[PDB]
Scaffold this active site. Structure first.
Site, PDB file in Angstrom:
ATOM      1  N   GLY A 273       0.803  -1.202   0.000  1.00 51.07           N
ATOM      2  CA  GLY A 273       0.000   0.000   0.000  1.00 51.07           C
ATOM      3  C   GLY A 273       0.842   1.262   0.000  1.00 51.07           C
ATOM      4  O   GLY A 273       2.065   1.242   0.161  1.00 51.07           O
TER       5      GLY A 273
ATOM      6  N   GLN B 248       5.352   4.535   2.010  1.00 48.96           N
ATOM      7  CA  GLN B 248       5.826   5.761   2.634  1.00 48.96           C
ATOM      8  C   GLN B 248       6.365   5.542   4.042  1.00 48.96           C
ATOM      9  O   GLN B 248       7.127   6.382   4.527  1.00 48.96           O
ATOM     10  CB  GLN B 248       4.716   6.807   2.645  1.00 48.96           C
ATOM     11  CG  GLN B 248       4.264   7.202   1.258  1.00 48.96           C
ATOM     12  CD  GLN B 248       3.257   8.320   1.277  1.00 48.96           C
ATOM     13  OE1 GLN B 248       2.877   8.810   2.339  1.00 48.96           O
ATOM     14  NE2 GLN B 248       2.814   8.734   0.100  1.00 48.96           N
TER      15      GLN B 248
ATOM     16  N   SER C 201      -2.023  -0.681   6.236  1.00 46.22           N
ATOM     17  CA  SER C 201      -3.093   0.085   6.856  1.00 46.22           C
ATOM     18  C   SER C 201      -4.423  -0.618   6.624  1.00 46.22           C
ATOM     19  O   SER C 201      -4.662  -1.161   5.543  1.00 46.22           O
ATOM     20  CB  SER C 201      -3.147   1.500   6.287  1.00 46.22           C
ATOM     21  OG  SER C 201      -3.221   1.467   4.875  1.00 46.22           O
TER      22      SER C 201
ATOM     23  N   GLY D 155      -7.897  -0.035   0.240  1.00 45.74           N
ATOM     24  CA  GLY D 155      -8.287  -1.232  -0.487  1.00 45.74           C
ATOM     25  C   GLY D 155      -7.147  -2.218  -0.665  1.00 45.74           C
ATOM     26  O   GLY D 155      -7.319  -3.421  -0.456  1.00 45.74           O
ATOM     27  N   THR D 156      -5.968  -1.722  -1.052  1.00 40.51           N
ATOM     28  CA  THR D 156      -4.807  -2.598  -1.186  1.00 40.51           C
ATOM     29  C   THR D 156      -4.381  -3.147   0.166  1.00 40.51           C
ATOM     30  O   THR D 156      -4.300  -4.367   0.347  1.00 40.51           O
ATOM     31  CB  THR D 156      -3.644  -1.858  -1.843  1.00 40.51           C
ATOM     32  OG1 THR D 156      -4.098  -1.196  -3.027  1.00 40.51           O
ATOM     33  CG2 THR D 156      -2.542  -2.831  -2.206  1.00 40.51           C
TER      34      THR D 156
ATOM     35  N   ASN E 117      -3.157   7.374  13.423  1.00 39.91           N
ATOM     36  CA  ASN E 117      -2.564   8.674  13.140  1.00 39.91           C
ATOM     37  C   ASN E 117      -2.943   9.741  14.159  1.00 39.91           C
ATOM     38  O   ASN E 117      -2.174  10.686  14.355  1.00 39.91           O
ATOM     39  CB  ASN E 117      -2.966   9.128  11.742  1.00 39.91           C
ATOM     40  CG  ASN E 117      -2.280   8.333  10.659  1.00 39.91           C
ATOM     41  OD1 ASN E 117      -1.609   7.340  10.934  1.00 39.91           O
ATOM     42  ND2 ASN E 117      -2.440   8.766   9.416  1.00 39.91           N
TER      43      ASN E 117
ATOM     44  N   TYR F 175       2.770  13.406   7.445  1.00 36.79           N
ATOM     45  CA  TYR F 175       2.955  11.964   7.339  1.00 36.79           C
ATOM     46  C   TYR F 175       4.423  11.562   7.409  1.00 36.79           C
ATOM     47  O   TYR F 175       4.737  10.486   7.922  1.00 36.79           O
ATOM     48  CB  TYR F 175       2.325  11.457   6.044  1.00 36.79           C
ATOM     49  CG  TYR F 175       0.823  11.303   6.119  1.00 36.79           C
ATOM     50  CD1 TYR F 175       0.169  11.286   7.342  1.00 36.79           C
ATOM     51  CD2 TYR F 175       0.060  11.169   4.968  1.00 36.79           C
ATOM     52  CE1 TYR F 175      -1.198  11.142   7.415  1.00 36.79           C
ATOM     53  CE2 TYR F 175      -1.309  11.027   5.034  1.00 36.79           C
ATOM     54  CZ  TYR F 175      -1.932  11.014   6.262  1.00 36.79           C
ATOM     55  OH  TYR F 175      -3.296  10.871   6.342  1.00 36.79           O
TER      56      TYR F 175
ATOM     57  N   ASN G  17       6.096   8.937   9.951  1.00 36.09           N
ATOM     58  CA  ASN G  17       6.873   7.802   9.466  1.00 36.09           C
ATOM     59  C   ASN G  17       8.239   7.724  10.127  1.00 36.09           C
ATOM     60  O   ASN G  17       8.771   6.624  10.304  1.00 36.09           O
ATOM     61  CB  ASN G  17       7.035   7.882   7.952  1.00 36.09           C
ATOM     62  CG  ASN G  17       5.724   7.750   7.224  1.00 36.09           C
ATOM     63  OD1 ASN G  17       4.696   7.448   7.825  1.00 36.09           O
ATOM     64  ND2 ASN G  17       5.746   8.007   5.925  1.00 36.09           N
TER      65      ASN G  17
ATOM     66  N   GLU H  36      10.192 -14.369  20.417  1.00 33.52           N
ATOM     67  CA  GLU H  36      10.058 -14.143  21.852  1.00 33.52           C
ATOM     68  C   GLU H  36       8.825 -13.311  22.171  1.00 33.52           C
ATOM     69  O   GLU H  36       7.972 -13.732  22.961  1.00 33.52           O
ATOM     70  CB  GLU H  36      11.312 -13.457  22.382  1.00 33.52           C
ATOM     71  CG  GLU H  36      12.602 -14.114  21.943  1.00 33.52           C
ATOM     72  CD  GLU H  36      13.245 -14.908  23.045  1.00 33.52           C
ATOM     73  OE1 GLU H  36      12.585 -15.088  24.083  1.00 33.52           O
ATOM     74  OE2 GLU H  36      14.407 -15.349  22.881  1.00 33.52           O
TER      75      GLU H  36
HETATM   76  N1  LIG Z   1       0.645   6.594   9.515  1.00 27.33           N
HETATM   77  C1  LIG Z   1       0.451   6.812   8.218  1.00 27.33           C
HETATM   78  N2  LIG Z   1      -0.740   6.442   7.629  1.00 27.33           N
HETATM   79  C2  LIG Z   1      -0.950   6.659   6.312  1.00 27.33           C
HETATM   80  C3  LIG Z   1       0.035   7.254   5.543  1.00 27.33           C
HETATM   81  N3  LIG Z   1      -0.429   7.352   4.280  1.00 27.33           N
HETATM   82  C4  LIG Z   1      -1.675   6.831   4.233  1.00 27.33           C
HETATM   83  N4  LIG Z   1      -2.016   6.409   5.487  1.00 27.33           N
HETATM   84  C5  LIG Z   1      -3.280   5.759   5.872  1.00 27.33           C
HETATM   85  O1  LIG Z   1      -3.766   4.999   4.783  1.00 27.33           O
HETATM   86  C6  LIG Z   1      -5.177   4.997   4.762  1.00 27.33           C
HETATM   87  C7  LIG Z   1      -5.726   4.969   3.335  1.00 27.33           C
HETATM   88  O2  LIG Z   1      -5.109   3.988   2.525  1.00 27.33           O
HETATM   89  P1  LIG Z   1      -3.817   4.388   1.658  1.00 27.33           P
HETATM   90  O3  LIG Z   1      -2.575   3.871   2.336  1.00 27.33           O
HETATM   91  O4  LIG Z   1      -3.763   5.886   1.513  1.00 27.33           O
HETATM   92  O5  LIG Z   1      -3.978   3.726   0.203  1.00 27.33           O
HETATM   93  P2  LIG Z   1      -3.961   2.138  -0.014  1.00 27.33           P
HETATM   94  O6  LIG Z   1      -3.622   1.428   1.271  1.00 27.33           O
HETATM   95  O7  LIG Z   1      -2.979   1.791  -1.102  1.00 27.33           O
HETATM   96  O8  LIG Z   1      -5.447   1.795  -0.517  1.00 27.33           O
HETATM   97  P3  LIG Z   1      -5.953   2.255  -1.972  1.00 27.33           P
HETATM   98  O9  LIG Z   1      -5.572   3.689  -2.228  1.00 27.33           O
HETATM   99  O10 LIG Z   1      -7.450   2.101  -2.042  1.00 27.33           O
HETATM  100  O11 LIG Z   1      -5.301   1.379  -3.008  1.00 27.33           O
HETATM  101  C8  LIG Z   1      -5.599   6.259   5.491  1.00 27.33           C
HETATM  102  O12 LIG Z   1      -6.584   5.953   6.447  1.00 27.33           O
HETATM  103  C9  LIG Z   1      -4.360   6.774   6.190  1.00 27.33           C
HETATM  104  O13 LIG Z   1      -4.583   6.821   7.576  1.00 27.33           O
HETATM  105  C10 LIG Z   1       1.234   7.626   6.129  1.00 27.33           C
HETATM  106  O14 LIG Z   1       2.111   8.156   5.453  1.00 27.33           O
HETATM  107  N5  LIG Z   1       1.443   7.404   7.471  1.00 27.33           N
HETATM  108 MG   LIG Z   2      -3.695   3.648  -3.182  1.00 25.93          MG
END
Ligand SMILES: Nc1nc2c(ncn2[C@@H]2O[C@H](COP(=O)(O)OP(=O)(O)OP(=O)(O)O)[C@@H](O)[C@H]2O)c(=O)[nH]1
Ligand SMILES: [Mg+2]
Ligand SMILES: Nc1nc2c(ncn2[C@@H]2O[C@H](COP(=O)(O)OP(=O)(O)O)[C@@H](O)[C@H]2O)c(=O)[nH]1
Ligand SMILES: Nc1nc2c(ncn2[C@@H]2O[C@H](COP(=O)(O)OP(=O)(O)O)[C@@H](O)[C@H]2O)c(=O)[nH]1
Lengths: 17, 433, 54, 443, 51, 34, 432
Positions: free
Chosen positions: B10, B15, B133, B137-138, B199, B217, B221, B247
């Site tokens: 994802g 990131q 996360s 979706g992914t 977050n 973000y 990270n 462990e």
């Molecule tokens: N802690 C943290 N959470 C993140 C970050 N970027 C996205 N998220 C979380 O990711 C969630 C949404 O999914 P994304 O990661 O943006 O995209 P994805 O997981 O690839 O899912 P799709 O876009 O549908 O393919 C949000 O609820 C954010 O809280 C990040 O840089 N740090």
């Molecule tokens: Mg995405």
């Protein structure tokens, strides 16, 4: 000049040409 | 020879992995080119080519190109293998159905081929760390099918999850409760350990402690990378007590369905306060139990601690560790269940936490990370079931899931399993006689 | 000298520009829409020379 | 590599298309010849979304321009950026529609779709992975409404598993500049209901109100109106072409904003628009953008959201910005306005953040609102259609061109079913389940 | 009753079976799985092994 | 806060106490304390 | 840290507020362009109370200017400090009120407030911790009294747990410039009483007396009158923006000035004022400020406390001074004037000390007095209202726009009940 068909057209200058 | 394989899936996974691998390169003294300027300590995360090239043991998986292309173009474009960054063509579009049945099923053959080719280079393998996360979706669907086929491929190897739990108030989507139900339903049987973060709590911590009135973000990270490096410092650098991955796989999961620890790091402070504070072992271990310093937005005063795992780094002595743990036990606010009279595990490591240029944290001699299992996440499950049920009464957003691969009864079974999980939590939390 | 300092700079609103300092801005283009075609800066001159024509 | 094919229908569609292509050509740094003269490397990274490569480093738009009158194509070709279009994508008839839906749907439009669909399939089968189709048209004319809906129906029949986007200029009760508008507006919504994934309603009196009150222009002409419409059109799909911290493409917005397949009518808005005199008194900040975007003056449709309930809300921000402020503002507005949001969906608002702003700007944002206050538009159209059809005015122009009288009644019935569906989803309780469950199965 | 009818058509429904597609390269390269030759389709024919 | 009556008549999945009488006594004490 | 939203109603409100913004812009060091050209560090420390930050280091006031005639807006914008206000903060109607409370409250003021409240909420939700709202208006007009009290009522309903300060220019018997003004003066007292936290009563004849006798000017214009009103207005909120040894903000003064919810009318006064020829001959000390504060020649109302009883007295000093002299003077006045203060409230005085003096001045002081002698104003207004209403003067203007005749009767009854309560608290014994 642009809107007329290729038949039924006399010698005319097309836009940007 | 101990090694771990990182799977960042994802946009959230990619990131987080950027900051994590920048931190690892700075820890081991690797240039962005990928070459050092007799020590083999990098072998936990890097593979040494005969010409001196170091390649990480990470797989970046995504269904959109817009965040993998930044990795392929930016500063560390010469470090990663070109083959280890896998990119689809259409994103999952916030559908568990698309991520699990229609789009996610296509590229898992390639992903598992990469996983096998990285796991056949391992002289001794500890486990897989999955960064994802729940919301996306992914990060829902492809993570679920990745762990199902990963349990098929490898028998009982340890799977640690670093997962972004949905925040109780803020979110960036609508269909997050649907994705969270359908994610936890499968990972409940196909996951080994699952460390929760969200977050909102890290926003509050960065706003109050690091004196940043506008976090980002990247600022989140960096803290997550510090947590993962504190986990793996016992493998990479020598210490008084060594903690391996299995462990705290064993020591925080007391029952087959309860594998959701909460993470905490201390001290997270700035320079103008590090100039004033004496950061001793008692202070850094009192900062971990504070409910305002928790990294998941839930109050541990509602629940009871099941187990704790503490990892100290730096100029730290076992006597000052154990006196402070005794003080924590004798305090009355912190409560343990009756069937856990021995509630702690500790690890001591010698190398202090490193500092990155431009980072937010201060250069500190000693630090501590905590992984604790409480009963106070039953309220989080109850709120998430509230949101799922309140959407599911009118059958809203259900046609997107139904017309793309999965039937309707999977919703009902995935909610009926989580209601049993809530009753499991209260049964565990109820004390004897 | 911290990375991402400009998001939390206290003097960020002091070291800013209104993006429409004058009519002859190079940066104001059609995609960033601080400039519009319907603003008749020639309205009164056009009205006066129309009156002369009449 | 998610390509979007543009379709422009009618005079309104062609003028909005010309202005929109000028706007994004300037955004990507393309001169009217077609070449590239820019300053950044991130502009040619994702340019295949809208531009086909030509020989010698040229770029041509992936758009078709379709008309029943030859007069509009001359002005489009000789307009500001008329050079960039390929001459084979101008598909025009010779006899106009005359503001008639029957001529555009049965008599004259049926002979033109066979020639349009060849070009549409030609530019849709050459793509790498098609994101979907975009349409620009107006429901008040004959070329835009009738033959536009016929193209929609045929394209939906041929390509089912793609995305369909429409920018429809719905008529106005006050700025109605055609007598026979209610017939064309009522017979088109039924073809828009089950053949479109997303539809954005843009209204001329709302655009005029924005240009009078918010912008205070002296002469707000059609160039300014299409300039605002292009501002709407760019920020929806900026996440496909530019990188960001949080991405959301067309499918990602449609999934989160469309809860049921008959509820896909949106009201749009743009954020940093300021008058000439009130520029120096104003600072560009994220709370300012979120504060001013939800203003009822800002909406590009003549529907007041205070008369309804916000079913779903989406916001796409652009620029260098912090995620905490965005999340806290969109939590704060939801917690304050407790009654304007529906109660069977928690967290009605979706967030997307892109890095690259519009040229010459620091920060910007775009709003898309799915609201239940859109039913008053259909009610006004239905009441004028009923008023005309009760006395059978202007009916020979439609009946003598191959239409029976039952199509008007079925259009009225379908519009009434749509407004009843919207009303029932507005006045629905959330703390209740009933009459379709399994009678509390098991024990 | 639109709410009840939407719930009824959602309940009385089936899911669309996906068409098997596999992806080959790092960048996405979608190919149909049935006529590629990586799936034993033609072994299952009726005339296998007999004239 | 609110849940359906559909998902109320579903039981637990673990069985940790030795006897049902001991479980009922523990649950009664916990309910009286809470 | 605590924001104050400023409201300007009518021509009188616009002029007084414009002079007030000029005075405190000069206090905080702001040029007419809008930027900051100062010489101290405490100028910019507390500036968010009245100013909003903009781009380029610019500050714009948090004020709204509401009028029913566009004539005053052009003069305000073309004045000396007219370019500092944001253009959207001017809300002006096209048809005037014409000295008609009925037009201001029912016909013309019904549609203007739907546009005013948008701007007021826009500037009220942008503050972090809103301290409250301030109003400046006059009851002698139409768009100041009627629509002004309608705005007061709607703001009271929208924001209940806040602060409402008003500066009301109640009419005068000798400097009466409007025939129909008793109706406007009477019909707004009920709406002030039921919806206002603090009211300060200003009289034009009182200001004329000050400028005739103490300042000795030959042409006492409304500029000088607004200068006096603004110099009173700044010293009430100076403790919010400037540090001191003992602080007292608006809520602090309201708590100690309002012992009963129907008693929130104050008489103000200012202290250091002196004539140009007498400027060199007067020494500036705390006894001089205290002796010139409490003079009955100095009050900003048509009220004399010799005929009444000082219910409670507040004093806000400005300048670097000693606390002992302030305390002993405020004790000495209480000891000497033993009959002019009530007995059932001991320690009738409140004191605040602020550090930074007014610009060009060394020491200063401001006085806010709650007294029973303010009821003679209401008695005079009520008796002139009854004198008109017995013969039904001017009633067609008020009836044809949609007002019943019972509103005048209930206004009489409520005003008489208020003055009866003031009589009762005048005739209060120490024990019973
Ligand atoms: N802690 C943290 N959470 C993140 C970050 N970027 C996205 N998220 C979380 O990711 C969630 C949404 O999914 P994304 O990661 O943006 O995209 P994805 O997981 O690839 O899912 P799709 O876009 O549908 O393919 C949000 O609820 C954010 O809280 C990040 O840089 N740090
Ligand atoms: Mg995405
Ligand atoms: N927003 C906008 N509206 C337009 C434009 N041109 C025409 N219209 C509106 O469209 C209506 C007529 O529709 P028309 O353009 O003739 O549709 P056509 O017959 O398909 O060309 C008129 O009421 C106009 O108000 C334009 O460039 N922009
Ligand atoms: N103190 C003071 N009084 C004023 C000022 N301007 C007008 N007035 C008084 O207000 C009365 C007229 O007010 P008016 O203009 O009708 O108020 P409006 O109708 O609300 O605009 C006159 O009797 C004046 O004495 C001023 O600047 N200061």
């Amino acid at each position: 000049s642009f809107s007329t068909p290729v038949p039924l057209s006399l010698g005319k200058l097309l836009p940007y040409e | 020879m101990r090694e771990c394989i990182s799977i960042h899936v994802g946009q959230a996974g990619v990131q987080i992995g950027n900051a994590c691998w920048e931190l690892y390169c700075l820890e081991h003294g690797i240039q962005p080119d990928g070459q050092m300027p007799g020590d083999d300590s990098f072998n936990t995360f890097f593979s040494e080519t005969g010409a001196g090239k170091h390649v990480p043991r990470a797989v970046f998986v995504d269904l959109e190109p817009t965040v993998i292309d930044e990795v392929r173009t930016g500063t560390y474009r010469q470090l990663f293998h070109p083959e280890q960054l896998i990119t689809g063509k259409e994103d999952a579009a916030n559908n568990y159905a698309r991520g699990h049945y229609t789009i996610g099923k296509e590229i898992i053959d390639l992903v598992l081929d990469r996983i096998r080719k990285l796991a056949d280079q391992c002289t001794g393998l500890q486990g897989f760390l999955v960064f994802h996360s729940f919301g996306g979706g992914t990060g829902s669907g492809f993570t679920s099918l990745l762990m199902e086929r990963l349990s098929v491929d490898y028998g009982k190897k340890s799977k640690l999850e670093f997962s972004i739990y949905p925040a109780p108030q803020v979110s960036t989507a609508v269909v997050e409760p649907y994705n969270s139900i359908l994610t936890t339903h499968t990972t409940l049987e196909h996951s080994d350990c699952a460390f929760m973060v969200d977050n909102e709590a890290i926003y509050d911590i960065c706003r109050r402690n690091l004196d940043i009135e506008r976090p980002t973000y990247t600022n989140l990270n960096r803290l997550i990378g510090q947590i993962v490096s504190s986990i793996t410092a016992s493998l990479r650098f020598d210490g008084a007590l060594n903690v391996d991955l299995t462990e705290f796989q064993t020591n925080l999961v007391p029952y087959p369905r309860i594998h959701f620890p909460l993470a905490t790091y201390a001290p997270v402070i700035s320079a103008e306060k590090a100039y004033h504070e004496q950061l001793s072992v008692a202070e850094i271990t009192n900062a971990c139990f504070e409910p305002a310093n928790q990294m998941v937005k839930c109050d541990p005063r509602h629940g009871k601690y099941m187990a704790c795992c503490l990892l100290y780094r730096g100029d730290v002595v076992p006597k000052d560790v154990n006196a402070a743990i005794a003080t924590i036990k004798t305090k009355r606010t912190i409560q343990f269940v009756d069937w856990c009279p021995t509630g702690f595990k500790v690890g001591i490591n010698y190398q202090p936490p490193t500092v990155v240029p431009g980072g937010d944290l201060a250069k500190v001699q000693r630090a501590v990370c905590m992984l604790s299992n409480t009963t106070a996440i039953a309220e989080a499950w109850a709120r998430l079931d509230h949101k799922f049920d309140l959407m599911y009464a009118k059958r809203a957003f259900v046609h997107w899931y139904v017309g793309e691969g999965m039937e309707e009864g999977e919703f009902s079974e995935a909610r009926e399993d989580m209601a049993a999980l809530e009753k499991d939590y209260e049964e565990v939390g109820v004390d004897s006689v | 000298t911290r990375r991402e300092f400009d998001l939390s700079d206290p003097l960020a609103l002091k070291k800013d520009l209104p993006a429409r300092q004058s009519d002859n801005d190079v940066r104001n283009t059609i995609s960033g829409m601080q400039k519009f075609m319907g603003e008749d800066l020639n309205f009164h001159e056009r009205k006066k020379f129309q009156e002369e024509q009449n | 590599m998610r390509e979007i094919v543009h379709l422009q229908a009618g005079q309104c569609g062609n003028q909005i298309g010309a202005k929109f292509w000028e706007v994004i050509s300037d955004e990507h740094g393309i001169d009217p010849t077609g070449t590239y003269h820019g300053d950044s490397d991130l502009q040619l990274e994702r340019i295949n979304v809208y531009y086909n490569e030509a020989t010698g480093g040229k770029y041509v738009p992936r758009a078709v321009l379709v008309d029943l009158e030859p007069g509009t194509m001359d002005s489009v070709r000789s307009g500001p950026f008329g050079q960039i279009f390929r001459p084979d994508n101008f598909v025009f008839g010779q006899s106009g529609a005359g503001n008639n839906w029957a001529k555009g749907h049965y008599t004259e439009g049926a002979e033109l779709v066979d020639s349009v669909l060849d070009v549409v399939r030609k530019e849709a089968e050459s793509c790498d992975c098609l994101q979907g189709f975009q349409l620009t048209h107006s429901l008040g004319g004959g070329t835009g409404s009738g033959m536009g809906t016929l193209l929609i129906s045929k394209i939906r029949e041929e390509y089912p598993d793609r995305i369909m986007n429409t920018f429809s200029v719905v008529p106005s009760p006050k700025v109605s500049d055609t007598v026979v508008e209610p017939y064309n507006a009522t017979l088109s919504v039924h073809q828009l209901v089950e053949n479109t994934d997303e539809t954005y309603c843009i209204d001329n009196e709302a655009l005029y109100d924005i240009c009078f009150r918010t912008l205070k222009l002296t002469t707000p002409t059609y160039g300014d109106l299409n300039h605002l419409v292009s501002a709407t059109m760019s920020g929806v799909t900026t996440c496909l072409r530019f990188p960001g911290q949080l991405n959301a493409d067309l499918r990602k917005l449609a999934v989160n904003m469309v809860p049921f397949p008959r509820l896909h009518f949106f009201m749009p808005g743009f954020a940093p628009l300021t008058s000439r005199g009130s520029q120096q008194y104003r600072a560009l900040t994220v709370p300012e953008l979120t504060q001013q975007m939800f203003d009822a003056k800002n909406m590009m449709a003549a529907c007041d959201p205070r008369h309804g309930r916000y079913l779903t809300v989406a916001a796409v921000f652009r620029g260098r910005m912090s995620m905490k402020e965005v999340d806290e503002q969109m939590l704060n507005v939801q917690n304050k306005n407790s009654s304007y949001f529906v109660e069977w969906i928690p967290n009605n608002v979706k967030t997307a953040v892109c890095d690259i702003p519009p040229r010459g700007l620091k920060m910007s944002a775009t709003f898309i609102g799915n609201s239940t206050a859109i039913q008053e538009l259909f009610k006004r159209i239905s009441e004028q259609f009923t008023a005309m059809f009760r006395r059978k005015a202007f009916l020979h122009w439609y009946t003598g061109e191959g239409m029976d009288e039952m199509e008007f009644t079925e259009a009225e019935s379908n519009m009434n079913d749509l407004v009843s569906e919207y009303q029932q989803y507005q006045d629905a309780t959330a703390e209740e389940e009933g009459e379709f469950e399994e009678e509390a199965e098991e024990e | 009753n639109f709410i009840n009818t939407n719930a009824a058509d959602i309940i009385m429904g089936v899911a669309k079976k996906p068409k098997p597609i596999y992806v080959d390269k790092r960048t996405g390269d979608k190919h149909d799985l049935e006529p590629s030759g990586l799936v034993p389709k033609y072994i299952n024919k009726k005339d296998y092994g007999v004239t | 806060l609110w849940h359906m009556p559909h998902f109320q008549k579903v039981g637990r999945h673990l069985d940790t106490f030795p006897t049902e009488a001991d479980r009922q006594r523990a649950l009664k004490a916990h309910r009286e304390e809470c």
